[PDB]
């Protein structure tokens, strides 16, 4: 599936046909032919297949709090089959075992996956003591914390990953985003060198692999907070293998409106350019200007952004979720990646309850993959 | 226990002893004497003894969501013994039975009291569908509504009282106040004719029995919200039998400060007088001027407030919660009543984790007494 196939074969075939004397239309723009063939290559990037392969090379421990949920179970089987990770499901062992037989799945407790029982836990005193020492000053009493471990699976899995029992965690298939995130932010803490976190959702457009952030974390991100989001999203996209072409989006077209929200983007731009000059980024611009090069070159030819931009940064959360949701039904394509969490010290990702099992498998892979590096 | 006993006996005995001539000091001012002893009656009224008796005549069904909690268990015994209410406890039936045996209480499940098992109840599909129809537009998904009924005890009892299966409810022994209250407000609804909710805590004091509001519901009540809190408190205290002496406390003393906090009080004072002129109330005043009649008469001769006040209204919850918390340990007396919820349509109250067993006993009684009427 190497992309350079089209770049090398079709010109060498057309030139050999032009010379062997069978071609009806020689092409004068023989170098532009080369350019067009790269335009296909920027689009349709295949970042998921390698990610899985490195996951197979070093499987890690992954906790899934919603063990009783059916979508979690279908993925645990697919994970054990492909050899990606060792899943630890939290929940009631009896309801999980009964549901597995109802689904027909062949995965079995104690071997394929390890069940942690929220009601009965031998380390139950250690987990609420750990959780209490983290939340004692944040308004969670001891009597609440014990009730917190039995009630919220997400709290249990967080304590495990911090202690070292589990290596990564994926949750959020049941429950609103901010209920899980609050647990994650408090226990794991911000990654060193970072003071704000962000969510990124991936979608496959006619424009190619395209990203949106921040989706579920920050309602009105700060100018400085928008900068830390862009940098991390650029690094994560680089880590997938795609070239980071960033675009700060707004209702204002390159200073057409001087409102506080459009002004916020332009300040963020100057803070990013000093931190990472090598990064390609330009704003603020209309959405269309970020995806269609022809529109951006008419509004400003000197712009450093080249082509369709793969990373899109939204001025506020509302612009993100309204755009991302509408686009998912507008460009029907398979789920590449769910809501990526960035900026947390331990490898964790949180999903929405409308995520497919395939969406779950991918995110668990992305976690194990991130968990190998430390 | 009649208060009028010392009102008529002690003067009449004094009048015959002066006629007999054996008295050494004649109390020539009998009417002043009558005023002195009627004041002693007014300061110390039990206001619980009639309540308990009323509960004994008609015990009602009370649901205590945190049934496993030991303090609830201790109170359930005294409720069964005194024949005050029909207790329905929610929790894991196995832990309750074990703790009962460790505690040595004579209450027997299914005999003295009824238990509803949170993990399994036949009336589960009906309850989550009932809670979902109230909370579908308030951010509760179908899947969330189910999970709430298994692990949120307060939600279970709320649905019962609204259905009619249970007559009243007493909760809050475990958890922050606002968690339980949020459940209560959305399910039961505001009482008709009221648009705000009020919490009242009572301490027997040197000045007498005294009430304070609003302690937990509203962090910064506006002017009309204070007025409604006042009127409800005057109604509730009149039920107790103590005549209502209302004083709107503030840092300003009768206009010493023109800041918005003091301005809010004065407006409410005019609002209260227009809605019901009969109530005895004067504001604003220093804290001390509401208790020592000597201090108030010096700042305000024609003050309508006469004597030590018993209903102190606060400008903001912080002043209230700090006043009541400081006085509860500076009085060191019987608990009387705890946080009295006012404005809710159904007979409900929420307590604090520091609530004693006597407080739970007294408060469960108070609720049974509320349930006799409709």
A176/B147 CB distance under 8 A: no
Query: CA nearest B148 in A: which residue?
Result: A151
Which residues are A211's β-sheet partners? A202, A311
Contact B171, B350 (CB under 8 A): yes
Distance from CA of B155 to the nearest CA of A (A): 14
- Helices marked H in chain B — which ranges? 4-20, 30-43, 49-57, 70-81, 93-103, 125-135, 142-151, 153-163, 177-188, 223-240, 260-275, 293-299, 317-331, 357-371
Provide the sign of the torsion angle of the four alpha carbons A13, A18, A22, A26, taken in this order: positive
C-alpha–C-alpha distance, residues B44 and B204, integer Å: 8
Per DSSP, B243 falls in state: P
Task: Give the orientation angle of helix B153-163 with respect to helix B142-151, to 10 degrees.
Answer: 100
What the block records as the tokens of B272 is 């209260």
Contact B336, B355 (CB under 8 A): no
C-alpha–C-alpha distance, residues B352 and A275, integer Å: 51
- What is the full DSSP assignment across B131-163? HHHHHTTTT--HHHHHHHHHH-HHHHHHHHHHH
Across chain A, where does the E strand assignment appear? 61-64, 86-90, 114-116, 168-171, 198-205, 208-213, 245-249, 280-285, 311-313, 340-342, 348-350
Cα separations in angstroms, A53 against A58, A166, A168, A335, A360: 9, 21, 18, 18, 17
Instruction: Name every chain B residue with its beta carbon within 8 A of the beta carbon of A139.
Output: 176
Q: A44-67 b/e with 16+ CB inside 10 Å = b?
A: ebebbeebbeebeeebbbbbbbbb
B139/A176 CB distance under 8 A: yes
Task: Give the orientation angle of helix B357-371 with respect to helix B70-81, to 10 degrees.
Answer: 50
C-alpha–C-alpha distance, residues A182 and A68, integer Å: 22
C-alpha torsion A23→A26→A29→A32, nearest 10: -10
Q: List all residues 6 or more positions away from A173 whose beta carbon is below 8 Å from its beta carbon.
A: A66, A69, A71, A72, A351, A352, A353, A355, A360
Neighbour-count burial of A5, counting CB atoms closer than 10 A to its CB (0-12 exposed, 13-18 middle, 19+ buried): exposed
Instruction: Name every chain B residue with its beta carbon within 8 A of the beta carbon of A143.
Output: 174, 353
Instruction: Name every chain B residue with its beta carbon within 8 A of the beta carbon of A147.
Output: 174
Look at chain B and count its residues. Answer: 374
Strand pairing category for B340-342 and A114-116: unpaired
- Residue A253 CB-half CA count within 13 A: 10
Distance from CA of B139 to the nearest CA of A (A): 9
Elucidation technique: X-ray
Per DSSP, B69 falls in state: S
Query: CA nearest A149 in B: which residue?
Result: B151
Which residues are A348's β-sheet partners? A169
A176/B353 CB distance under 8 A: no
Instruction: Name every chain B residue with its beta carbon within 8 A of the beta carbon of A176.
Output: 139
B353/A151 CB distance under 8 A: no
Instruction: Name every chain B residue with its beta carbon within 8 A of the beta carbon of A175.
Output: 144
Nearest CA-CA partner of B350 in B154, B112, B202: B154
Contact B262, B250 (CB under 8 A): yes
Q: How far is CA A32 from the centre of its chain?
A: 35
What the block records as the tokens of B91 is 């929790």
Q: How far is CA B314 from the centre of its chain?
A: 16
Q: List all residues 6 or more positions away from A247 whose beta carbon is below 8 Å from its beta carbon.
A: A281, A282, A283, A285, A289, A290, A305, A309, A311, A312, A313
Instruction: Name every chain A residue with its beta carbon within 8 A of the beta carbon of B175.
Output: 144
Cα separations in angstroms, B43 against A299, B10, B35: 82, 17, 12
- Taking CB atoms and an 8 Å cut-off, how many pairs form between chains A and B? 16
B174/A139 CB distance under 8 A: no
Which residues are A245's β-sheet partners? A280
Q: Which of B139, B147, B175 is facing A144, going by the closest CB pair?
A: B175
Contact B368, B84 (CB under 8 A): yes
Q: Which of B143, B151, B175 is facing A174, going by the closest CB pair?
A: B143
Contact residues of A toward B, CB < 8 A: 139, 141, 143-144, 147, 150-151, 174-176, 353
Distance from CA of A66 to the nearest CA of B (A): 12
Q: Which of A141, A151, A176 is facing B151, going by the closest CB pair?
A: A151
**A208-213 β-sheet, strand order:** A280-285, A245-249, A311-313, A208-213, A198-205, A340-342
**B60-64 β-sheet, strand order:** B114-116, B85-90, B60-64, B168-171, B348-350
Peptide bond into B187 cis (omega under 30): no
C-alpha–C-alpha distance, residues B321 and B373, integer Å: 31
Q: List all residues 6 or more positions away from B155 whose beta carbon is below 8 Å from its beta carbon.
A: B131, B148, B149, B183, B187
Q: Which residue has the tokens 């692999």?
A: A209
Instruction: Name every chain A residue with its beta carbon within 8 A of the beta carbon of B176.
Output: 139
Q: List all residues 6 or more positions away from B240 whose beta carbon is below 8 Å from its beta carbon.
A: B45, B47, B51
Q: List all residues 6 or more positions away from A5 whose beta carbon is below 8 Å from its beta carbon.
A: none
C-alpha–C-alpha distance, residues B338 and B71, integer Å: 15
| Three-state SS at A247 | strand
C-alpha–C-alpha distance, residues B215 and B338, integer Å: 11
Contact A219, A264 (CB under 8 A): no
Best of B138, B176, B180 to disrupt the A interface (most A CBs within 10 Å) is B176
Contact B189, B345 (CB under 8 A): yes
B174/A353 CB distance under 8 A: no
Query: CA nearest B68 in A: which residue?
Result: A147
What the block records as the tokens of B1 is 């226990």
B176/A139 CB distance under 8 A: yes
Task: Give the orientation angle of helix A93-103 with respect to helix A70-82, to 10 degrees.
Answer: 70
C-alpha–C-alpha distance, residues B360 and B170, integer Å: 8
Distance from CA of A140 to the nearest CA of B (A): 9
Instruction: Name every chain A residue with its beta carbon within 8 A of the beta carbon of B151.
Output: 150-151
Query: CA nearest B145 in A: which residue?
Result: A175
């Amino acid at each position: 599936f190497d992309p350079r196939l089209i770049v090398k074969i079709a010109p060498a075939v057309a030139k050999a046909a032009m010379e062997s004397g069978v071609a009806t239309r020689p092409i004068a723009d023989f170098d532009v032919y080369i350019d067009k063939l790269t335009e296909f290559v920027y689009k349709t990037n295949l970042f998921m297949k390698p990610i899985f392969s490195q996951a197979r090379k070093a499987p890690k421990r992954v906790v899934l709090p919603e063990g009783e949920e059916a979508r979690v179970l279908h993925a645990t089987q697919e994970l054990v089959t492909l050899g990606l990770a060792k899943p630890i499901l939290i929940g009631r062992p009896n309801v999980i075992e009964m549901r597995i037989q109802k689904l027909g799945l062949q995965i079995k407790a104690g071997v394929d996956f390890e069940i942690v029982n929220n009601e009965s836990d031998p380390r139950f005193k250690e987990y609420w003591t750990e959780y209490f020492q983290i939340m004692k000053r944040r308004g969670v009493t001891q009597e609440q914390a014990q009730r917190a471990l039995i009630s919220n699976p997400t709290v249990i899995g967080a304590i495990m990953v911090q202690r070292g029992e589990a290596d990564a965690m994926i949750c959020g298939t049941v429950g609103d985003y901010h209920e899980h995130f609050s647990v994650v932010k408090n226990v794991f803490g911000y990654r060193d060198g970072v003071h704000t976190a962000g969510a990124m959702n991936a979608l496959l457009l006619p424009s190619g692999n395209t990203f949106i952030a921040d989706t579920y974390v920050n309602d009105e991100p700060d100018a400085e907070e928008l900068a830390e989001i862009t940098l991390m999203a650029a690094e994560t996209v680089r880590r997938f293998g795609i070239e980071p072409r960033v675009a700060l989006l707004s209702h204002s077209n390159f200073g057409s409106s001087d409102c506080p929200s459009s002004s916020k983007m332009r300040q963020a731009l100057e803070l990013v350019r000093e931190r990472a000059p090598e990064l390609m980024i330009d704003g603020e611009m209309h959405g269309d200007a970020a995806l269609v090069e022809a529109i951006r070159n008419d509004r400003m030819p000197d712009s450093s952004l080249k082509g369709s931009a793969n990373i899109l940064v939204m001025p506020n959360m509302e612009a993100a979720r309204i755009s991302y949701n509408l686009l998912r039904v507008s460009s029907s394509e398979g789920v590449t990646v769910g809501p990526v969490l960035m900026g947390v010290a331990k490898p964790v990702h949180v999903l929405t309850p409308i995520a497919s099992v395939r969406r779950i498998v991918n995110m668990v892979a992305l976690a194990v993959v991130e968990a190998q590096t430390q």
